[model samples]
Target chain A: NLSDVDLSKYITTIAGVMTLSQVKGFVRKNGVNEAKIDEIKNDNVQDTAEQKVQLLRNWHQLHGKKEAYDTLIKDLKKANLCTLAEKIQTIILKDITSDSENSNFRNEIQSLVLE
Target chain B: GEEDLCAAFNVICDNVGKDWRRLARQLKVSDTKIDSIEDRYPRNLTERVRESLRIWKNTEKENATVAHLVGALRSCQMNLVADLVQEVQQARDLQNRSG
Candidate 1:
């Protein structure tokens, strides 16, 4: 049986990737409208520019890193895909640390070494 | 013991691989069956195919999911077998040093 620890990490990684893709897709699709495109070139653009900027800012703010993690974990657990959640956590933990000082990364390497 | 453990691991690996292949075949067959059914019925084939495909796809997906879980279990077993072999080898090395 797969350990809950490993399984949770896997679930988290998959969910993070999926959630990030979705958020990026949504921003790309909705951020470019006819009015917004015209406003970018308009000489007297004020409200429209601000509105467009705010829309994008809001979208990004809503789908930022911590939010994505929270949302992803919830969905993963709901789907009973906690193994992947654990994997994602390990991946995130690795990404944020330096190779020389990262104990978690070292632990993962040692596990593989023993394997 | 190491040899027996390795033998068991190979068996488990083979079983997992077989299950995965079987699930893949079932999914492919389900797709083919839906295509044939759609071709035979020209009228409202869209709805018919959609309904049948939904059921077929769900079954195939669940089978694939289970296959993946079994594969994970086999992987854990393989790792344990490797660890056991390493431990045995280490013990032998220590005995040689002492003797």
Candidate 2:
């Protein structure tokens, strides 16, 4: 289900939930190449989590796909960022549940309109 | 605790002004929800912000905390607003401690 989830939308929160160093570690472990890790870990863009996540999103699009979410969690765990991994999992779970609820609401409306 | 956060949110709604959308994004309030909130209140800046914060609070519910809001404000470069909100939270904490 996470693979079905569009990760682009949750990128901000994903970035928000992690520290600069934690993000760096996630990318360092999962980056397409080591060069990108250096670029992402650069000091200049250390201003906000959003800036860091911007680069992470770039890397993700180039190298990530359906397995991106799972890989991120796995990498976070491997990097010893277990709590961050759990936080992201909670977000994903929330999104999945909300999607189902929204679909139910849509079906209810459709049925009422067809009557 | 809910009342305390509501008070802090009131301070935020008063001062965040036009930067509300940036804060909302940093808060991970969702773009579509932000758009709907925008369409829901056309002219009133304060109401738009209030509604946005309301959605974030209700959605996150117990997970929502003043520290999280403060982080989003600082991330959006609204440091002064963040300071004010932090102070509001601190004052509430002090009151609770004394009682």
Best by TM-score: 2
Question: Clashes per prediction?
Answer: 20, 0
Candidate 2 ranges beyond 4 A from true positions: A1-115
Q: Candidate 1 residues A52-104, lDDT tens each? A: 33333444344544453344334323332343345446666766864565556
TM-score of chain A of 2: 0.47
Q: State the TM-score of the second chain for every model.
A: 0.24, 0.94
CA lDDT of each prediction against the hidden true structure: 0.37, 0.62
* Residue A112, candidate 1: C-alpha displacement in angstroms: 19
Alpha-carbon deviation at A80 in model 2, angstroms: 37
Q: What are the clashing pairs of model 2?
A: none
Error of 1 at B62 (Å): 4.3
Please provide TM-scores, in order, for all candidate models, with all chains considered together: 0.21, 0.46
Cα error of candidate 2 at position A94, Å:
46
**What is the per-residue lDDT of model 2 for residues A1-115, given as tens digits with 9 covering 90 to 100?**
2221224334543454346676766666665466765565574555666656665676577653335545654543343334324544555566677735444444432322220
Task: Tell me model 2's lDDT, rounded to 2 decimals.
Answer: 0.62
